[PDB]
């Protein structure tokens, strides 16, 4: 897969530093209330969620290549980001119907790729839940949906970042040993599908192809995999796309994520960055409520910075430039 | 633009800049017509067959045919060599329990897939009340932006059909709706002529209910001929895009007389996408007498309908190759 228009390339560059994506993300649009819900008794507010987002944006984007935000609540935050940091806006509705197994994708009702571009984004991000082994008609609908979005992004000449989260229709918990044994299959086969030209993806945002918590040396409990087997999953992942791809952090600590990046590189993965945030800013939330907005600012300038700086130093030794895939 | 490929497709759908197209993407509407002439529920085979019969028999006389991907792909493959293809992209009908009538693409289709199925155009039907809920219309506008963008990327003409309604008026055949129809139609056209929606051709209602116009009415008269004519001129002043009329199932003769009246009034419309005014009578014949009787109906009454329409189009429609 080898194409970038002049504008898509300029946008990718705005999202990167020396071909590496070190992008700052937020978690959901409801998750933040709960981290706040620890105290007071209020749910406060639309006014305040937009604020902490603006504090995290303003203080930490100077050290990130870009920031990913939600349009429904993140636009104020997007306007206070560093001038040297690019912007991705999410296009999907969050969550899924737990009562069914289909997890069908659905774009935000009053958004379009055109509107995302008009709001100043350098990329459209869309999250798809995909079970390669799932219902074939469900997956046809999902493929059709991504084709439309890839087409929109082609027309608006804006990079398409497709996030894939894998699951199994018949496995309740994706942290389970049961899901771990098939994760490589789910992750890598999904990448093969959505690497096809017809879906118009510019960058894949994906899980590491193994639950490192069950790998020898990284596991606290039961061991399902040797380091050699885990490494093979990373090489298989590298072989599953020619597109740039970046890793999301899921279910692991900042330290284990960083150890995973080192292990990915060692194994032969040519990942081109990461898109994580929660670990980087999560601590600012309590401080925000125990000492106020100015103190959260202080947290971000010191602890927040230390977090993202640590990560960047790791990225500097492990990530590969996406320019090498062009 | 038109881009090279969009222009080539528009040419395949047209003759000398005029779209003389046959519409048969009916699904829910076709079901209700067949439901009048039998107690049994219409099957898949009967819907596919009637569509193929109309396609095979009448597309020699049309510049193109509009079919639906659900039942119409076999019909699409037996169309005349000289006729282009449009495929419908929207799910049929709307929710009668609410007033929003929100649009929804067919679940396993995309503009890319429509192009791959051999269409020279994507057709999408939007129900629109210009005076309706502001948030509903915002959602509608965003949806059309997405389709227009898909069609730009796949480099395939976007035909947007607009059917108007009023959230608080149950029956769009009523005098009450007639009195506001010109507003509904012409202001909707003006919105969806905005560049951001990527429309190449508007498929629209005539901006008057001609059954209430002086000289055409058989009962109550709501409008003089001069008032009706002015509604056509306002329609022409609402867009510089190519636009074509749908027949809305009036008689072949009223539709024909309406086109004459439109041209006389100053409407520079670029053709039609006409279905029921042409083949409506074939449904009962197919159900009650079977496919052979339907062919013969199509070869006589159907031909007669479409032939008389084409003659009227020849002396009323304006070429879109002026609007480019
Ligand atoms: O509700 P359904 O089953 O989806 O049918 C609607 C569809 O047929 C219309 O959009 C016609 O294409 C259009 O009005 C031109 O057809 P005529 O009005 O000229 O017959
Ligand atoms: Ca930069
Ligand atoms: Ca314009
Ligand atoms: Ca005009
Ligand atoms: Ca003439």
């Amino acid at each position: 897969t080898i194409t970038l228009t002049e504008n898509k390339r300029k946008s990718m560059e705005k999202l990167s530093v020396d071909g590496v994506i070190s992008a700052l993300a937020f978690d959901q649009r409801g998750a933040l209330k709960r981290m706040m819900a620890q105290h007071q008794t209020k749910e406060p507010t639309v006014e305040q969620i937009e604020e902490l987002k603006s504090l995290v944006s303003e203080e930490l984007t100077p050290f990130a290549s870009s920031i990913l935000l939600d349009p429904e609540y993140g636009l104020p935050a997007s306007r206070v980001r560093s001038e040297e940091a690019g912007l991705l806006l999410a296009y999907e509705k969050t969550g899924y119907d737990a009562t069914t197994t289909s997890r069908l994708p659905d774009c935000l009702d009053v958004w379009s790729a055109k509107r995302i571009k008009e709001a100043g984004a350098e990329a459209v991000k869309f999250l798809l839940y995909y079970d390669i082994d799932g219902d074939q008609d469900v997956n046809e609908q999902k493929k059709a949906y991504i084709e439309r979005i890839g087409s929109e992004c082609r027309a608006e000449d804006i990079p398409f970042y497709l996030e894939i989260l894998t699951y199994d229709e018949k496995i309740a918990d994706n942290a389970s040993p049961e899901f771990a044994k098939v994760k490589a299959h789910k992750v890598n086969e999904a990448m093969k599908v959505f690497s096809k030209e017809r879906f118009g993806v510019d960058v894949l945002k994906v899980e590491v192809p193994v639950n490192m918590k069950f790998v020898e040396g990284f596991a606290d409990g039961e061991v399902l995999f040797t380091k050699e087997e885990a490494a093979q999953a990373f090489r298989d992942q590298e072989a599953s796309t020619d597109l740039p791809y970046i890793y999301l952090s899921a279910g692991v600590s900042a330290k284990l994520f960083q150890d995973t990046l080192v292990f990915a590189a060692e194994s032969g993965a040519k990942f081109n960055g990461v898109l994580c945030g929660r670990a980087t800013w999560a601590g600012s939330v309590k401080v925000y409520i125990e000492e106020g907005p100015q103190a959260a600012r202080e947290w971000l300038r010191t602890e927040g910075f230390k977090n993202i700086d640590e990560l960047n130093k790791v990225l500097d030794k492990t990530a590969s430039p996406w320019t090498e895939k062009m």
Side-chain angles (χ1 to χ4, degrees), chain A residues 15-257:
Chain A
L15 293 169
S16 317
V17 185
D18 297 324
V20 176
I21 297 160
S22 51
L24 182 65
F26 255 101
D27 296 42
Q28 218 78 342
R29 278 132 256 186
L32 215 66
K33 322 214 259 163
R34 311 194 260 262
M35 305 181 45
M36 292 173 60
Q38 56 179 197
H39 301 145
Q40 305 169 335
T41 54
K42 315 296 191 78
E43 44 169 22
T45 55
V46 168
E47 307 85 79
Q48 205 149 234
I49 291 169
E50 286 181 3
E51 188 182 7
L52 181 87
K53 283 190 145 131
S54 295
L55 296 177
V56 176
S57 186
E58 186 175 359
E59 295 299 332
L60 295 187
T61 54
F63 317 115
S65 75
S66 59
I67 179 162
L68 166 61
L69 293 161
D70 71 284
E72 284 203 82
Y73 305 85
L75 296 179
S78 67
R79 296 168 205 140
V80 299
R81 76 188 186 274
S82 174
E83 191 172 9
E84 287 70 22
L87 173 66
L88 312 89
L89 293 172
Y91 192 15
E92 84 284 344
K93 293 182 188 176
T94 50
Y96 55 91
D97 189 339
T99 66
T100 63
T101 63
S102 52
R103 305 196 193 186
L104 295 167
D106 195 10
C107 296
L108 299 165
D109 293 331
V110 293
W111 289 89
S112 65
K114 178 179 292 298
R115 291 171 185 219
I116 283 168
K117 186 172 183 189
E118 285 168 334
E122 270 92 28
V124 173
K125 173 262 179 176
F126 190 90
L127 166 60
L128 176 68
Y129 289 99
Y130 207 75
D131 177 4
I132 188 74
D133 301 310
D135 182 274
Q136 288 183 4
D137 294 322
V138 167
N139 280 344
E140 206 62 45
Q141 177 168 357
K142 289 183 176 179
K143 284 181 267 193
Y145 208 74
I146 299 307
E147 287 168 18
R148 302 180 197 163
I149 294 168
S151 289
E152 285 196 72
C153 291
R154 174 175 161 82
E156 300 299 319
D157 215 10
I158 178 168
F160 179 21
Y161 280 56
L162 175 68
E163 187 184 340
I164 303 174
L165 286 178
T166 58
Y167 74 112
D168 187 291
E169 288 181 353
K170 292 178 176 178
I171 301 172
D173 174 27
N174 65 329
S176 69
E178 183 183 3
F179 183 83
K181 290 170 188 176
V182 296
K183 190 186 188 186
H185 177 71
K186 304 289 191 186
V187 171
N188 296 341
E189 292 304 317
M191 290 178 64
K192 295 184 187 181
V193 174
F194 289 103
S195 290
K196 289 177 192 299
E197 175 184 349
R198 68 182 299 104
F199 300 106
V201 180
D202 297 294
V203 177
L204 291 165
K205 171 185 178 184
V206 300
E207 304 158 290
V208 293
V210 52
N211 185 340
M212 293 299 289
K213 295 187 183 183
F214 294 109
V215 181
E216 190 125 50
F218 303 85
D220 294 325
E222 181 182 19
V223 183
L224 301 181
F225 309 108
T226 71
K227 287 185 165 73
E228 178 52 38
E229 288 164 327
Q232 183 57 45
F234 281 98
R235 288 187 288 274
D236 288 344
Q237 180 177 55
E238 175 58 38
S240 293
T241 183
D242 292 331
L243 287 170
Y245 64 95
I246 60 178
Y247 291 139
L248 58 94
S249 185
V252 303
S253 68
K255 293 293 181 184
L256 177 53
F257 186 61

